[PDB]
Design an enzyme around this catalytic site. Sequence first.
Site: not given
Ligand code: NAP
Ligand code: 3PJ
Lengths: 272, 272
Positions: A199-200, A163, A101, A167, A72, A202
Site C-alpha cells: 500500500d505505498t 518491470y 525502481i 525483476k 539518479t 505510488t
Molecule cells: N508497492 C508495491 O505494490 C510493490 C510490490 C512489489 C514490489 N515492490 C518493490 O518495492 C520497492 C519499492 O517500491 P515502492 O512502491 O515503495 O516505491 P515508491 O514508493 O514509489 O518509491 C520509489 C523510490 O525510488 C526513488 N526513485 C525513483 N526513480 C529513481 C531514480 N531514477 N534514481 C534513484 N531513485 C529513484 C523514489 O524517489 P525519487 O523519485 O525522489 O527519486 C523513491 O524514493 C521496489 O523495488 C518495488 O519493485 C513494490
Molecule cells: C510501480 C507500481 O507501483 C507497481 C506496483 C506493484 C507492482 C507489482 O510488483 N505487482 C506484483 C506484486 C503483485 C503488480 C502486479 C499487477 C497488479 C496486481 C494484479 C492482481 N492480480 O492483483 C495490477 C495490475 C493491473 C491492474 C491492477 C493491479 C498490481 C501489482 C508493479 C508496479 C505501479 F505500477 F505504479 F503500480
Amino acid sequence: QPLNEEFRPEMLQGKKVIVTGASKGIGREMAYHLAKMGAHVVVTARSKETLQKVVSHCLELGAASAHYIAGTMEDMTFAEQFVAQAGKLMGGLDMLILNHITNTSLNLFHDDIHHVRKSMEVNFLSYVVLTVAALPMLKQSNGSIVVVSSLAGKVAYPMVAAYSASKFALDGFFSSIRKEYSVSRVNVSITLCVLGLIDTETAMKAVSGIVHMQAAPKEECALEIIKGGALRQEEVYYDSSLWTTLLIRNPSRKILEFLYSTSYNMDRFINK
Amino acid sequence: QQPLNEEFRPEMLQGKKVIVTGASKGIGREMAYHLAKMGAHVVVTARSKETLQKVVSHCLELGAASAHYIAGTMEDMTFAEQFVAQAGKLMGGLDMLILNHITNTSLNLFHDDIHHVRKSMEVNFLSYVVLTVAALPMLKQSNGSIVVVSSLAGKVAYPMVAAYSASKFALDGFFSSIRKEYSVSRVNVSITLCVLGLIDTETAMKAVSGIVHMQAAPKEECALEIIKGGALRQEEVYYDSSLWTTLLIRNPSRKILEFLYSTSYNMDRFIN
Ligand SMILES: NC(=O)c1ccc[n+]([C@@H]2O[C@H](COP(=O)([O-])OP(=O)(O)OC[C@H]3O[C@@H](n4cnc5c(N)ncnc54)[C@H](OP(=O)(O)O)[C@@H]3O)[C@@H](O)[C@H]2O)c1
Ligand SMILES: C[C@](O)(c1ccc(C(=O)N(C2CC2)[C@H]2CC[C@](CCC(N)=O)(c3ccccc3)CC2)cc1)C(F)(F)F
Ligand SMILES: NC(=O)c1ccc[n+]([C@@H]2O[C@H](COP(=O)([O-])OP(=O)(O)OC[C@H]3O[C@@H](n4cnc5c(N)ncnc54)[C@H](OP(=O)(O)O)[C@@H]3O)[C@@H](O)[C@H]2O)c1
Ligand SMILES: C[C@](O)(c1ccc(C(=O)N(C2CC2)[C@H]2CC[C@](CCC(N)=O)(c3ccccc3)CC2)cc1)C(F)(F)F
C-alpha cells in the site's frame, strides 16, 4: 546459509546500512525501522527535500547517525560514487538494501523500447553497480545484500512486462552470484525479497478503481524485509494472498540446483 | 494461449515464412536446416557473412522454398529493427520468428564487469524485444508465432553464468508477461519459450572440454524440438538429456498460480 536464532531488534544496533529509494514507500519504512533499532543509515533517491524529511525523522527515532545523498540511479557513475561516500560517512558498511525502481505505470506493452531499457538500467543494472562498489566493505564486515523484488519477478502478470523483465533479471543474477559466493567462500549474504502488492502511495494511486487483490501494509512489509535480511535468509516473501504458498513451497528449483551443484550430485544420474 | 491439439507433422511448415537468428552455427544453424527439409521460406541471420552464405546454399540444397541471409550484429538495435522489415519483404510476410542468438560468454566467476552484464542484456534480451516489436504487425496478419530460445539457467540458478542467467530470466519475465497481455487483448500470436539443458554445440563443447559430468544433448534433435513446440503453439518446450531434469523443470503450479491471481480481488475473491 542463514543465522540460527530468532530476530531481535538489537541485531541492527550500530550496524551500518544503506537504503536506496528511501524517500517514499517501502524504503522510507525500512529507514524508520533501522533508525528505531539504533542503526547508522544513509538513504538515497533523487529528491533533496523528501530525503531530508526522512533523515530528520530517523534522527528523532534513535539512529546512531543519519545522512542522505541525492541523485539518479540512471547514472552509474553516481551509483558507484554514492556507495563510496556513504561508506565514508559511516566508516564501513554492514547491509546494502537495494530498493529503488524507475517510475513505471500499469499498462499494456506496445512499443516502448526505451522504457524496457530504462527499467533494465535502473531496476537491475544499477543494483549490480552498487553491489560491485559495496562488496569490499561487505567482505570486511561479513555483511548482507538485500534485493527488493516482486511476485511479478517469479510469475507472469499482464501490465508489468518491462518491470517483470527486470525483476526476473534480479533473481537470475543474484541467485547465480549467491552460488559463486558459496564456492569462493565470500561470507556475504544475499536476500531476495518477493513482495505482493504493497500500500505505498505510488502503487495505491496506480491501482485506484481497478479490480485487484488486497494490498498488504507497507510498515510490516518493511520490517519483514529487514528481518529476513538480518537473518541472512535466501528469500523473504511478503503478501496477503492465500494462493502465494503455491509459489513459496514449490521445491523443484531447489532440487534441480542441488542435483547440479557438485560432481557427486551430478554423478547420481549423469555419466562422467 | 491455446496449443494446437493436432500431432506435429513436417508439412506444418511447408511454405511457411520463418526468421532464425543465431543461424551461422549451433542450434540456430540446425534449425535453419530442419526448416529447409520441410520446404519453408527462411531468412537467416548472424554476423558471419560467408558462413551464412554457405548456410543459405545448403538450405536451398535440402529443399527450402526460398533462402536468404542478412548479416549484422544484434548489439545494434537499429539493425534488429531493419532486419525484420527487410526479411518480411524478402518472404512476402512472416509466420514464425525464432529468436536464438546470444553474445559470447564464458564460464567464469563474476567480478566487476558491468559492461559484459549490460552487453548480455542488450544482445540476449533487449534485441529480442526489438525484433518482436518489429515483427508483430506481420505476425498478427498471419496469426504467427514467436519462439524464444532460453535455458535451464533461465529457470534455476548456476554459478559461472551470472550475466547470462540474468538475461535468460529476463526473457521469461518479459515474454511470459506479454503472453498474458496477448490473451486478454485477443492477439492471436503464440509465444513459445524453450528451456534447454547442455547442448553439444561446438561453443559449449569447447567451454566444457575436460570437465566431468558434461552430458550434452544432440543439437539436431534440440533444433527439431524447438521447431515443433513453436509450430504447435506450446507455451514452453523443455529439452535436456536427463529424464529427471526434463520432468522436474516443468512448473504447472506457477501457471495455476497465475490463473488464480488473474481471477482474484480483495481477499482472494473470485471475479466470475
Ligand atoms: N508497492 C508495491 O505494490 C510493490 C510490490 C512489489 C514490489 N515492490 C518493490 O518495492 C520497492 C519499492 O517500491 P515502492 O512502491 O515503495 O516505491 P515508491 O514508493 O514509489 O518509491 C520509489 C523510490 O525510488 C526513488 N526513485 C525513483 N526513480 C529513481 C531514480 N531514477 N534514481 C534513484 N531513485 C529513484 C523514489 O524517489 P525519487 O523519485 O525522489 O527519486 C523513491 O524514493 C521496489 O523495488 C518495488 O519493485 C513494490
Ligand atoms: C510501480 C507500481 O507501483 C507497481 C506496483 C506493484 C507492482 C507489482 O510488483 N505487482 C506484483 C506484486 C503483485 C503488480 C502486479 C499487477 C497488479 C496486481 C494484479 C492482481 N492480480 O492483483 C495490477 C495490475 C493491473 C491492474 C491492477 C493491479 C498490481 C501489482 C508493479 C508496479 C505501479 F505500477 F505504479 F503500480
Ligand atoms: N549450447 C548449449 O549448451 C545451450 C544450452 C542452453 C541454451 N542454449 C541457447 O541456445 C541458443 C544458441 O546457442 P548455441 O550453443 O547454438 O550458440 P552458438 O553455437 O555459440 O552460436 C550462437 C549464435 O549467435 C550468433 N551471434 C553471436 N553474437 C551475435 C551478435 N552480436 N549479433 C547477432 N548474432 C550473434 C552467432 O553467430 P556469429 O558469430 O556469426 O554472429 C551464432 O550463430 C542460445 O540462445 C543459447 O542461450 C544453448
Ligand atoms: C556460451 C556457452 O556455450 C554456454 C553454454 C551453455 C550455457 C547454459 O545455458 N548452461 C545451462 C543449460 C545448463 C550452462 C550452465 C553452466 C554449466 C553447467 C553446470 C552444471 N553443473 O552442469 C557449467 C558451468 C561451469 C563449468 C562447467 C559447466 C554449463 C552449461 C551457457 C553458456 C559457454 F559459456 F561458452 F559455455
